[PDB]
Amino acid sequence: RRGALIVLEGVDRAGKSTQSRKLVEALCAAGHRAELLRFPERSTEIGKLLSSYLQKKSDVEDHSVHLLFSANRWEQVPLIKEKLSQGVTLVVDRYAFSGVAYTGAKENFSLDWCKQPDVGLPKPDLVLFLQLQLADAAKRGAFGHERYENGAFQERALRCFHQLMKDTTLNWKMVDASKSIEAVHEDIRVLSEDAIATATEKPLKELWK
Amino acid sequence: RRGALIVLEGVDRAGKSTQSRKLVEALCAAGHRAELLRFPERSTEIGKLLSSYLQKKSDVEDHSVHLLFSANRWEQVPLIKEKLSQGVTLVVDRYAFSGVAYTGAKENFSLDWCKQPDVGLPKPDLVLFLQLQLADAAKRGAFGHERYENGAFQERALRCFHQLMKDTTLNWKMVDASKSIEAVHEDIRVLSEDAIATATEKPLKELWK
Ligand SMILES: Nc1ncnc2c1ncn2[C@@H]1O[C@H](COP(=O)(O)OP(=O)(O)NP(=O)(O)O)[C@@H](O)[C@H]1O
Ligand SMILES: Nc1ncnc2c1ncn2[C@@H]1O[C@H](COP(=O)(O)OP(=O)(O)NP(=O)(O)O)[C@@H](O)[C@H]1O
Ligand SMILES: Cc1cn([C@H]2C[C@H](O)[C@@H](COP(=O)(O)O)O2)c(=O)[nH]c1=O
Ligand SMILES: Cc1cn([C@H]2C[C@H](O)[C@@H](COP(=O)(O)O)O2)c(=O)[nH]c1=O
Ligand SMILES: [Mg+2]
Ligand SMILES: [Mg+2]
Ligand SMILES: [Mg+2]
Numbered sequence: 001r002r003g004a005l006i007v008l009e010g011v012d013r014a015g016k017s018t019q020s021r022k023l024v025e026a027l028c029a030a031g032h033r034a035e036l037l038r039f040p041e042r043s044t045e046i047g048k049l050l051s052s053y054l055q056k057k058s059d060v061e062d063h064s065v066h067l068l069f070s071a072n073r074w075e076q077v078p079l080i081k082e083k084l085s086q087g088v089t090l091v092v093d094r095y096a097f098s099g100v101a102y103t104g105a106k107e108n109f110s111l112d113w114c115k116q117p118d119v120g121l122p123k124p125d126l127v128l129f130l131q132l133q134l135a136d137a138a139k140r141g142a143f144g145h146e147r148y149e150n151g152a153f154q155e156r157a158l159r160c161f162h163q164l165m166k167d168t169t170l171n172w173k174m175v176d177a178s179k180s181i182e183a184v185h186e187d188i189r190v191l192s193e194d195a196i197a198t199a200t201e202k203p204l205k206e207l208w209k
Numbered sequence: 210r211r212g213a214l215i216v217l218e219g220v221d222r223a224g225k226s227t228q229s230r231k232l233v234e235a236l237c238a239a240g241h242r243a244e245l246l247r248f249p250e251r252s253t254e255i256g257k258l259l260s261s262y263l264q265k266k267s268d269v270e271d272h273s274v275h276l277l278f279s280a281n282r283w284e285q286v287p288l289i290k291e292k293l294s295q296g297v298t299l300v301v302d303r304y305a306f307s308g309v310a311y312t313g314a315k316e317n318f319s320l321d322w323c324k325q326p327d328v329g330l331p332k333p334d335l336v337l338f339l340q341l342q343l344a345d346a347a348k349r350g351a352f353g354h355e356r357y358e359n360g361a362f363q364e365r366a367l368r369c370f371h372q373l374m375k376d377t378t379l380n381w382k383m384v385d386a387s388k389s390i391e392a393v394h395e396d397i398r399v400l401s402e403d404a405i406a407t408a409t410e411k412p413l414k415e416l417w418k
Contacts, residue, residue, distance in 0.1 A: 045258055074273040
Protein backbone atom coordinates (compact mmCIF):
# COMPACT_ATOMS: atom_id res chain seq x y z
CA ARG A 1 0.00 0.00 0.00
CA ARG A 2 1.97 3.06 -1.03
CA GLY A 3 2.21 6.22 1.03
CA ALA A 4 0.90 9.56 -0.16
CA LEU A 5 2.92 12.47 -1.47
CA ILE A 6 1.57 15.60 0.19
CA VAL A 7 2.90 19.08 -0.65
CA LEU A 8 2.33 22.36 1.21
CA GLU A 9 2.71 25.54 -0.89
CA GLY A 10 2.08 29.26 -0.35
CA VAL A 11 3.83 32.64 -0.19
CA ASP A 12 6.31 33.78 2.44
CA ARG A 13 5.11 33.32 6.03
CA ALA A 14 1.98 31.49 5.00
CA GLY A 15 2.71 28.89 7.70
CA LYS A 16 4.07 26.04 5.53
CA SER A 17 6.91 24.94 7.83
CA THR A 18 4.82 25.11 10.99
CA GLN A 19 1.98 23.15 9.37
CA SER A 20 4.27 20.57 7.76
CA ARG A 21 5.93 19.79 11.10
CA LYS A 22 2.60 19.54 12.89
CA LEU A 23 1.07 17.40 10.13
CA VAL A 24 3.83 14.79 10.36
CA GLU A 25 3.56 14.74 14.18
CA ALA A 26 -0.23 14.17 13.96
CA LEU A 27 -0.08 11.40 11.32
CA CYS A 28 2.64 9.54 13.26
CA ALA A 29 0.57 9.84 16.41
CA ALA A 30 -2.42 8.45 14.50
CA GLY A 31 -0.35 5.40 13.60
CA HIS A 32 0.66 6.45 10.08
CA ARG A 33 4.25 6.09 8.83
CA ALA A 34 4.90 9.73 7.80
CA GLU A 35 8.13 11.67 7.23
CA LEU A 36 8.95 15.34 6.63
CA LEU A 37 10.84 16.69 3.57
CA ARG A 38 11.45 20.26 2.40
CA PHE A 39 12.68 22.11 -0.67
CA PRO A 40 15.14 23.47 -1.07
CA GLU A 41 17.00 20.70 0.72
CA ARG A 42 20.00 22.77 1.81
CA SER A 43 22.19 19.91 2.98
CA THR A 44 23.43 18.55 -0.36
CA GLU A 45 26.17 20.18 -2.47
CA ILE A 46 23.49 21.80 -4.66
CA GLY A 47 21.48 22.81 -1.59
CA LYS A 48 24.52 24.62 -0.21
CA LEU A 49 24.81 26.67 -3.42
CA LEU A 50 21.11 27.51 -3.10
CA SER A 51 21.41 28.43 0.56
CA SER A 52 24.30 30.76 -0.16
CA TYR A 53 22.31 32.35 -3.00
CA LEU A 54 19.25 32.83 -0.80
CA GLN A 55 21.30 34.32 2.03
CA LYS A 56 22.71 36.82 -0.49
CA LYS A 57 26.21 35.51 0.17
CA SER A 58 26.55 34.72 -3.54
CA ASP A 59 24.87 35.87 -6.72
CA VAL A 60 23.79 33.20 -9.21
CA GLU A 61 22.60 33.71 -12.81
CA ASP A 62 18.78 33.43 -12.76
CA HIS A 63 18.40 30.54 -15.23
CA SER A 64 21.19 28.65 -13.48
CA VAL A 65 19.61 29.10 -10.05
CA HIS A 66 16.27 27.91 -11.40
CA LEU A 67 17.85 24.70 -12.78
CA LEU A 68 19.69 24.17 -9.47
CA PHE A 69 16.35 24.36 -7.59
CA SER A 70 14.90 21.68 -9.87
CA ALA A 71 18.08 19.54 -9.71
CA ASN A 72 17.72 19.75 -5.91
CA ARG A 73 14.37 17.90 -6.20
CA TRP A 74 15.56 15.37 -8.78
CA GLU A 75 18.42 14.29 -6.47
CA GLN A 76 15.80 13.30 -3.86
CA VAL A 77 13.56 11.39 -6.35
CA PRO A 78 15.08 7.94 -5.83
CA LEU A 79 14.51 8.40 -2.05
CA ILE A 80 11.00 9.79 -2.51
CA LYS A 81 9.98 6.89 -4.73
CA GLU A 82 11.48 4.30 -2.42
CA LYS A 83 9.84 5.72 0.71
CA LEU A 84 6.39 5.99 -0.84
CA SER A 85 6.58 2.44 -2.23
CA GLN A 86 7.42 1.19 1.27
CA GLY A 87 4.22 2.72 2.67
CA VAL A 88 5.60 6.01 4.00
CA THR A 89 3.58 9.20 3.44
CA LEU A 90 5.85 12.16 2.72
CA VAL A 91 4.85 15.69 3.79
CA VAL A 92 6.84 18.18 1.68
CA ASP A 93 7.38 21.84 2.51
CA ARG A 94 7.47 23.44 -0.94
CA TYR A 95 8.02 21.62 -4.22
CA ALA A 96 8.00 22.32 -7.98
CA PHE A 97 5.22 24.92 -7.61
CA SER A 98 7.42 27.25 -5.51
CA GLY A 99 10.13 26.59 -8.12
CA VAL A 100 7.94 27.99 -10.94
CA ALA A 101 6.23 30.75 -8.95
CA TYR A 102 9.43 32.32 -7.65
CA THR A 103 11.48 32.24 -10.86
CA GLY A 104 8.26 33.16 -12.66
CA ALA A 105 8.12 36.37 -10.63
CA LYS A 106 11.27 37.63 -12.39
CA GLU A 107 10.87 39.56 -15.62
CA ASN A 108 10.97 37.55 -18.83
CA PHE A 109 10.66 34.01 -17.46
CA SER A 110 7.69 32.20 -19.02
CA LEU A 111 5.73 29.72 -16.92
CA ASP A 112 6.19 27.13 -19.64
CA TRP A 113 9.99 27.51 -19.47
CA CYS A 114 10.09 27.37 -15.66
CA LYS A 115 7.99 24.20 -15.51
CA GLN A 116 10.03 22.05 -17.90
CA PRO A 117 12.94 20.97 -15.71
CA ASP A 118 10.42 19.69 -13.20
CA VAL A 119 8.38 17.80 -15.80
CA GLY A 120 8.42 14.11 -14.77
CA LEU A 121 8.89 14.48 -11.00
CA PRO A 122 6.69 12.33 -8.75
CA LYS A 123 3.25 14.03 -8.89
CA PRO A 124 1.81 14.89 -5.46
CA ASP A 125 -1.43 13.23 -4.47
CA LEU A 126 -2.39 16.43 -2.67
CA VAL A 127 -1.15 20.00 -2.97
CA LEU A 128 -2.33 22.23 -0.09
CA PHE A 129 -2.18 25.96 -0.83
CA LEU A 130 -2.00 28.01 2.41
CA GLN A 131 -3.93 31.05 1.25
CA LEU A 132 -3.62 34.34 3.10
CA GLN A 133 -3.49 38.01 2.20
CA LEU A 134 0.03 39.34 1.78
CA ALA A 135 -1.08 42.08 4.20
CA ASP A 136 -1.81 39.55 6.95
CA ALA A 137 1.38 37.59 6.29
CA ALA A 138 3.25 40.87 6.66
CA LYS A 139 1.95 41.07 10.23
CA ARG A 140 3.62 37.76 11.08
CA GLY A 141 6.67 39.67 12.25
CA ALA A 142 9.02 41.26 9.72
CA PHE A 143 10.54 40.02 6.48
CA GLY A 144 13.72 37.96 6.83
CA HIS A 145 16.71 39.28 4.86
CA GLU A 146 16.77 36.38 2.43
CA ARG A 147 16.40 36.97 -1.27
CA TYR A 148 12.79 37.34 -2.42
CA GLU A 149 11.66 38.54 1.01
CA ASN A 150 10.01 41.79 -0.01
CA GLY A 151 6.44 42.77 -0.88
CA ALA A 152 6.69 43.34 -4.61
CA PHE A 153 8.41 40.06 -5.38
CA GLN A 154 5.96 38.09 -3.19
CA GLU A 155 3.00 39.67 -4.94
CA ARG A 156 4.40 38.54 -8.29
CA ALA A 157 5.04 35.01 -7.02
CA LEU A 158 1.47 34.84 -5.66
CA ARG A 159 0.09 35.78 -9.07
CA CYS A 160 2.15 32.93 -10.61
CA PHE A 161 0.82 30.46 -8.03
CA HIS A 162 -2.66 31.55 -9.18
CA GLN A 163 -1.84 30.59 -12.75
CA LEU A 164 -0.51 27.19 -11.72
CA MET A 165 -3.71 26.58 -9.85
CA LYS A 166 -5.58 26.39 -13.16
CA ASP A 167 -3.93 23.03 -13.91
CA THR A 168 -6.74 20.70 -12.90
CA THR A 169 -4.36 17.78 -13.42
CA LEU A 170 -3.35 18.30 -9.78
CA ASN A 171 -5.37 17.73 -6.59
CA TRP A 172 -5.14 21.32 -5.31
CA LYS A 173 -6.86 22.24 -2.03
CA MET A 174 -7.22 25.75 -0.70
CA VAL A 175 -6.55 26.21 3.02
CA ASP A 176 -7.56 29.35 4.92
CA ALA A 177 -4.09 29.97 6.40
CA SER A 178 -5.27 33.13 8.22
CA LYS A 179 -6.75 31.10 11.06
CA SER A 180 -4.93 30.01 14.21
CA ILE A 181 -2.15 27.41 14.07
CA GLU A 182 -4.37 24.71 15.54
CA ALA A 183 -7.36 25.49 13.38
CA VAL A 184 -5.31 25.52 10.20
CA HIS A 185 -3.66 22.31 11.36
CA GLU A 186 -7.00 20.49 11.78
CA ASP A 187 -8.13 21.48 8.25
CA ILE A 188 -4.86 20.22 6.80
CA ARG A 189 -4.87 17.01 8.86
CA VAL A 190 -8.37 16.00 7.75
CA LEU A 191 -7.56 16.63 4.10
CA SER A 192 -4.34 14.65 4.53
CA GLU A 193 -6.05 11.58 6.06
CA ASP A 194 -8.45 11.50 3.07
CA ALA A 195 -5.54 11.69 0.60
CA ILE A 196 -3.63 8.90 2.37
CA ALA A 197 -6.61 6.60 2.13
CA THR A 198 -7.05 7.16 -1.62
CA ALA A 199 -3.34 7.20 -2.58
CA THR A 200 -3.18 3.47 -1.79
CA GLU A 201 -5.53 3.06 -4.75
CA LYS A 202 -3.71 4.62 -7.70
CA PRO A 203 -0.11 4.49 -8.91
CA LEU A 204 2.20 7.41 -8.38
CA LYS A 205 2.07 9.61 -11.47
CA GLU A 206 4.42 12.06 -13.15
CA LEU A 207 4.10 15.81 -12.80
CA TRP A 208 3.24 18.03 -15.77
CA LYS A 209 3.66 14.94 -17.96
CA ARG B 210 30.08 44.68 -35.21
CA ARG B 211 29.38 41.66 -33.05
CA GLY B 212 31.56 38.57 -32.95
CA ALA B 213 30.34 35.16 -34.02
CA LEU B 214 29.37 32.28 -31.77
CA ILE B 215 30.96 29.15 -33.21
CA VAL B 216 30.40 25.70 -31.69
CA LEU B 217 32.29 22.46 -32.38
CA GLU B 218 30.36 19.23 -31.67
CA GLY B 219 30.94 15.51 -32.24
CA VAL B 220 31.41 12.20 -30.42
CA ASP B 221 34.34 11.22 -28.23
CA ARG B 222 37.76 11.74 -29.84
CA ALA B 223 36.31 13.44 -32.89
CA GLY B 224 39.00 16.15 -32.55
CA LYS B 225 36.90 18.97 -31.03
CA SER B 226 39.47 20.23 -28.51
CA THR B 227 42.38 20.09 -30.94
CA GLN B 228 40.38 21.90 -33.63
CA SER B 229 38.95 24.51 -31.25
CA ARG B 230 42.43 25.44 -30.01
CA LYS B 231 43.83 25.63 -33.52
CA LEU B 232 40.84 27.64 -34.79
CA VAL B 233 41.30 30.35 -32.16
CA GLU B 234 45.05 30.50 -32.86
CA ALA B 235 44.39 30.93 -36.62
CA LEU B 236 41.69 33.63 -36.25
CA CYS B 237 43.86 35.63 -33.83
CA ALA B 238 46.77 35.36 -36.23
CA ALA B 239 44.48 36.59 -39.02
CA GLY B 240 43.73 39.68 -36.95
CA HIS B 241 40.38 38.56 -35.52
CA ARG B 242 39.53 39.01 -31.83
CA ALA B 243 38.71 35.36 -30.95
CA GLU B 244 38.57 33.51 -27.62
CA LEU B 245 38.19 29.85 -26.63
CA LEU B 246 35.41 28.47 -24.36
CA ARG B 247 34.43 24.90 -23.52
CA PHE B 248 31.59 23.00 -21.90
CA PRO B 249 31.51 21.71 -19.36
CA GLU B 250 33.41 24.59 -17.80
CA ARG B 251 34.90 22.66 -14.88
CA SER B 252 36.21 25.62 -12.93
CA THR B 253 32.99 26.92 -11.36
CA GLU B 254 31.26 25.32 -8.35
CA ILE B 255 28.84 23.55 -10.71
CA GLY B 256 31.69 22.56 -13.03
CA LYS B 257 33.46 20.90 -10.11
CA LEU B 258 30.38 18.76 -9.39
CA LEU B 259 30.30 17.81 -13.08
CA SER B 260 34.00 17.01 -13.17
CA SER B 261 33.69 14.75 -10.15
CA TYR B 262 30.70 13.02 -11.76
CA LEU B 263 32.56 12.50 -15.03
CA GLN B 264 35.65 11.17 -13.27
CA LYS B 265 33.39 8.64 -11.52
CA LYS B 266 34.40 10.09 -8.15
CA SER B 267 30.73 10.77 -7.41
CA ASP B 268 27.41 9.48 -8.69
CA VAL B 269 24.73 12.03 -9.55
CA GLU B 270 21.04 11.38 -10.31
CA ASP B 271 20.65 11.54 -14.12
CA HIS B 272 18.06 14.34 -14.30
CA SER B 273 20.05 16.37 -11.79
CA VAL B 274 23.29 15.97 -13.73
CA HIS B 275 21.53 17.00 -16.93
CA LEU B 276 20.23 20.23 -15.30
CA LEU B 277 23.71 20.91 -13.87
CA PHE B 278 25.21 20.67 -17.39
CA SER B 279 22.68 23.23 -18.64
CA ALA B 280 23.13 25.48 -15.57
CA ASN B 281 26.87 25.37 -16.36
CA ARG B 282 26.14 27.10 -19.71
CA TRP B 283 23.63 29.59 -18.31
CA GLU B 284 26.21 30.83 -15.76
CA GLN B 285 28.48 31.81 -18.69
CA VAL B 286 25.69 33.57 -20.69
CA PRO B 287 26.27 37.08 -19.34
CA LEU B 288 29.97 36.72 -20.32
CA ILE B 289 29.16 35.19 -23.71
CA LYS B 290 26.74 37.99 -24.56
CA GLU B 291 29.12 40.70 -23.41
CA LYS B 292 32.09 39.32 -25.35
CA LEU B 293 30.17 38.89 -28.60
CA SER B 294 28.69 42.40 -28.36
CA GLN B 295 32.22 43.78 -27.95
CA GLY B 296 33.30 42.19 -31.25
CA VAL B 297 34.88 38.99 -29.94
CA THR B 298 34.21 35.72 -31.78
CA LEU B 299 33.85 32.81 -29.35
CA VAL B 300 34.92 29.28 -30.37
CA VAL B 301 33.13 26.80 -28.08
CA ASP B 302 34.13 23.19 -27.52
CA ARG B 303 30.77 21.49 -26.99
CA TYR B 304 27.52 23.23 -26.13
CA ALA B 305 23.81 22.41 -25.70
CA PHE B 306 23.94 19.74 -28.42
CA SER B 307 26.35 17.54 -26.41
CA GLY B 308 24.05 18.22 -23.44
CA VAL B 309 21.04 16.66 -25.25
CA ALA B 310 22.93 13.91 -27.10
CA TYR B 311 24.62 12.48 -24.02
CA THR B 312 21.67 12.54 -21.62
CA GLY B 313 19.55 11.46 -24.59
CA ALA B 314 21.66 8.30 -24.86
CA LYS B 315 20.31 7.10 -21.49
CA GLU B 316 17.11 5.06 -21.47
CA ASN B 317 13.88 6.98 -21.06
CA PHE B 318 15.07 10.54 -21.63
CA SER B 319 13.13 12.21 -24.45
CA LEU B 320 14.92 14.68 -26.72
CA ASP B 321 12.18 17.21 -26.02
CA TRP B 322 12.79 16.96 -22.26
CA CYS B 323 16.58 17.21 -22.59
CA LYS B 324 16.39 20.32 -24.79
CA GLN B 325 14.17 22.46 -22.56
CA PRO B 326 16.64 23.70 -19.95
CA ASP B 327 18.81 24.97 -22.77
CA VAL B 328 15.93 26.71 -24.56
CA GLY B 329 16.83 30.43 -24.75
CA LEU B 330 20.65 30.18 -24.71
CA PRO B 331 22.56 32.33 -27.21
CA LYS B 332 22.09 30.51 -30.56
CA PRO B 333 25.36 29.71 -32.35
CA ASP B 334 25.92 31.29 -35.73
CA LEU B 335 27.70 28.11 -36.80
CA VAL B 336 27.67 24.57 -35.42
CA LEU B 337 30.47 22.39 -36.86
CA PHE B 338 29.88 18.65 -36.51
CA LEU B 339 33.17 16.71 -36.65
CA GLN B 340 31.91 13.57 -38.34
CA LEU B 341 33.89 10.35 -38.15
CA GLN B 342 33.14 6.66 -37.81
CA LEU B 343 33.16 5.44 -34.22
CA ALA B 344 35.53 2.74 -35.52
CA ASP B 345 38.09 5.32 -36.64
CA ALA B 346 37.74 7.36 -33.45
CA ALA B 347 38.42 4.16 -31.54
CA LYS B 348 41.83 4.03 -33.23
CA ARG B 349 42.75 7.41 -31.77
CA GLY B 350 44.32 5.64 -28.81
CA ALA B 351 42.13 4.06 -26.15
CA PHE B 352 39.04 5.25 -24.30
CA GLY B 353 39.68 7.42 -21.24
CA HIS B 354 38.10 6.14 -18.01
CA GLU B 355 35.61 8.97 -17.76
CA ARG B 356 31.90 8.26 -17.68
CA TYR B 357 30.36 7.73 -21.13
CA GLU B 358 33.69 6.60 -22.61
CA ASN B 359 32.59 3.27 -24.04
CA GLY B 360 31.36 2.14 -27.45
CA ALA B 361 27.70 1.47 -26.76
CA PHE B 362 27.02 4.78 -25.06
CA GLN B 363 28.85 6.73 -27.80
CA GLU B 364 26.84 5.01 -30.50
CA ARG B 365 23.62 6.09 -28.75
CA ALA B 366 24.84 9.67 -28.37
CA LEU B 367 25.79 9.76 -32.07
CA ARG B 368 22.27 8.68 -33.03
CA CYS B 369 20.88 11.55 -30.89
CA PHE B 370 23.21 14.04 -32.58
CA HIS B 371 21.71 12.81 -35.87
CA GLN B 372 18.23 13.69 -34.68
CA LEU B 373 19.29 17.16 -33.58
CA MET B 374 20.76 17.72 -36.99
CA LYS B 375 17.26 17.74 -38.48
CA ASP B 376 16.59 21.13 -36.85
CA THR B 377 17.19 23.40 -39.83
CA THR B 378 16.85 26.38 -37.49
CA LEU B 379 20.60 26.00 -36.88
CA ASN B 380 23.52 26.60 -39.27
CA TRP B 381 24.94 23.06 -39.08
CA LYS B 382 28.03 22.18 -41.14
CA MET B 383 29.43 18.70 -41.54
CA VAL B 384 33.21 18.37 -41.29
CA ASP B 385 35.08 15.26 -42.41
CA ALA B 386 36.97 14.80 -39.12
CA SER B 387 38.75 11.65 -40.40
CA LYS B 388 41.34 13.71 -42.26
CA SER B 389 44.63 14.96 -40.84
CA ILE B 390 44.72 17.64 -38.14
CA GLU B 391 45.84 20.32 -40.59
CA ALA B 392 43.38 19.37 -43.29
CA VAL B 393 40.46 19.32 -40.90
CA HIS B 394 41.69 22.61 -39.49
CA GLU B 395 41.67 24.33 -42.91
CA ASP B 396 38.07 23.20 -43.59
CA ILE B 397 36.96 24.52 -40.21
CA ARG B 398 38.90 27.79 -40.56
CA VAL B 399 37.36 28.65 -43.94
CA LEU B 400 33.85 27.94 -42.70
CA SER B 401 34.58 30.04 -39.61
CA GLU B 402 35.80 33.10 -41.57
CA ASP B 403 32.56 33.00 -43.61
CA ALA B 404 30.44 32.84 -40.44
CA ILE B 405 32.32 35.74 -38.83
CA ALA B 406 31.67 37.94 -41.83
CA THR B 407 27.91 37.25 -41.82
CA ALA B 408 27.38 37.31 -38.03
CA THR B 409 28.06 41.06 -38.06
CA GLU B 410 24.84 41.31 -40.08
CA LYS B 411 22.17 39.72 -37.89
CA PRO B 412 21.38 39.93 -34.18
CA LEU B 413 22.26 37.10 -31.85
CA LYS B 414 19.25 34.81 -31.57
CA GLU B 415 17.92 32.40 -28.97
CA LEU B 416 18.36 28.65 -29.21
CA TRP B 417 15.39 26.31 -29.66
CA LYS B 418 13.16 29.35 -29.09
N1 LIG C 1 -1.59 30.23 11.94
C1 LIG C 1 -0.69 31.18 12.29
N2 LIG C 1 -1.07 32.31 12.89
C2 LIG C 1 -0.15 33.22 13.23
N3 LIG C 1 1.15 33.23 13.06
C3 LIG C 1 1.52 32.09 12.42
C4 LIG C 1 0.70 31.06 12.03
N4 LIG C 1 1.43 30.07 11.42
C5 LIG C 1 2.66 30.49 11.47
N5 LIG C 1 2.79 31.72 12.07
C6 LIG C 1 4.06 32.35 12.52
O1 LIG C 1 4.59 33.21 11.50
C7 LIG C 1 5.91 32.81 11.18
C8 LIG C 1 5.87 32.11 9.83
O2 LIG C 1 5.46 30.74 9.99
P1 LIG C 1 6.02 29.52 9.10
O3 LIG C 1 5.21 28.32 9.21
O4 LIG C 1 7.47 29.34 9.50
O5 LIG C 1 6.03 30.20 7.68
P2 LIG C 1 6.51 29.67 6.28
O6 LIG C 1 5.21 29.77 5.55
O7 LIG C 1 7.11 28.34 6.25
N6 LIG C 1 7.57 30.85 5.75
P3 LIG C 1 8.81 30.79 4.65
O8 LIG C 1 9.61 29.58 4.92
O9 LIG C 1 9.59 32.02 4.94
O10 LIG C 1 8.08 30.85 3.34
C9 LIG C 1 6.37 31.89 12.32
O11 LIG C 1 6.96 32.62 13.43
C10 LIG C 1 5.10 31.23 12.75
O12 LIG C 1 5.01 30.89 14.17
N1 LIG D 1 42.77 14.79 -37.26
C1 LIG D 1 43.24 13.88 -36.38
N2 LIG D 1 43.84 12.75 -36.79
C2 LIG D 1 44.31 11.88 -35.89
N3 LIG D 1 44.28 11.92 -34.57
C3 LIG D 1 43.66 13.05 -34.17
C4 LIG D 1 43.14 14.03 -34.97
N4 LIG D 1 42.59 15.03 -34.21
C5 LIG D 1 42.79 14.65 -32.98
N5 LIG D 1 43.44 13.45 -32.88
C6 LIG D 1 44.05 12.88 -31.66
O1 LIG D 1 43.13 12.00 -30.99
C7 LIG D 1 42.94 12.43 -29.65
C8 LIG D 1 41.57 13.09 -29.55
O2 LIG D 1 41.64 14.46 -30.02
P1 LIG D 1 40.78 15.67 -29.40
O3 LIG D 1 40.76 16.84 -30.26
O4 LIG D 1 41.33 15.91 -28.02
O5 LIG D 1 39.39 14.94 -29.21
P2 LIG D 1 38.04 15.45 -28.58
O6 LIG D 1 37.17 15.29 -29.79
O7 LIG D 1 38.03 16.79 -28.02
N6 LIG D 1 37.67 14.29 -27.44
P3 LIG D 1 36.72 14.36 -26.09
O8 LIG D 1 37.04 15.60 -25.36
O9 LIG D 1 37.14 13.16 -25.31
O10 LIG D 1 35.34 14.23 -26.66
C9 LIG D 1 44.09 13.40 -29.35
O11 LIG D 1 45.29 12.72 -28.87
C10 LIG D 1 44.36 14.04 -30.68
O12 LIG D 1 45.74 14.41 -30.94
C1 LIG E 1 11.70 25.01 -3.69
C2 LIG E 1 12.00 26.43 -4.05
C3 LIG E 1 11.96 27.53 -3.29
N1 LIG E 1 12.25 28.77 -3.78
C4 LIG E 1 12.26 29.79 -2.76
C5 LIG E 1 11.05 30.14 -1.87
C6 LIG E 1 11.72 30.87 -0.71
O1 LIG E 1 11.87 32.23 -1.09
C7 LIG E 1 13.10 30.23 -0.65
C8 LIG E 1 13.38 29.55 0.71
O2 LIG E 1 12.22 28.82 1.10
P1 LIG E 1 11.35 28.83 2.45
O3 LIG E 1 10.56 30.08 2.50
O4 LIG E 1 10.61 27.54 2.39
O5 LIG E 1 12.57 28.83 3.50
O6 LIG E 1 13.34 29.54 -1.87
C9 LIG E 1 12.59 29.11 -5.13
O7 LIG E 1 12.84 30.26 -5.52
N2 LIG E 1 12.62 27.97 -5.91
C10 LIG E 1 12.31 26.70 -5.50
O8 LIG E 1 12.38 25.59 -6.34
C1 LIG F 1 28.57 19.98 -22.43
C2 LIG F 1 28.29 18.56 -22.05
C3 LIG F 1 29.08 17.48 -22.15
N1 LIG F 1 28.67 16.24 -21.76
C4 LIG F 1 29.72 15.25 -21.84
C5 LIG F 1 30.48 14.89 -23.14
C6 LIG F 1 31.73 14.21 -22.58
O1 LIG F 1 31.41 12.84 -22.34
C7 LIG F 1 31.92 14.90 -21.24
C8 LIG F 1 33.28 15.63 -21.14
O2 LIG F 1 33.52 16.33 -22.35
P1 LIG F 1 34.75 16.34 -23.37
O3 LIG F 1 34.76 15.06 -24.12
O4 LIG F 1 34.57 17.59 -24.13
O5 LIG F 1 35.94 16.41 -22.27
O6 LIG F 1 30.71 15.57 -20.88
C9 LIG F 1 27.38 15.87 -21.26
O7 LIG F 1 27.06 14.72 -20.94
N2 LIG F 1 26.57 16.98 -21.18
C10 LIG F 1 26.90 18.26 -21.57
O8 LIG F 1 26.03 19.34 -21.44
MG1 LIG G 1 9.17 27.83 5.93
MG1 LIG H 1 37.94 17.36 -25.97
MG1 LIG I 1 7.20 21.83 -24.72
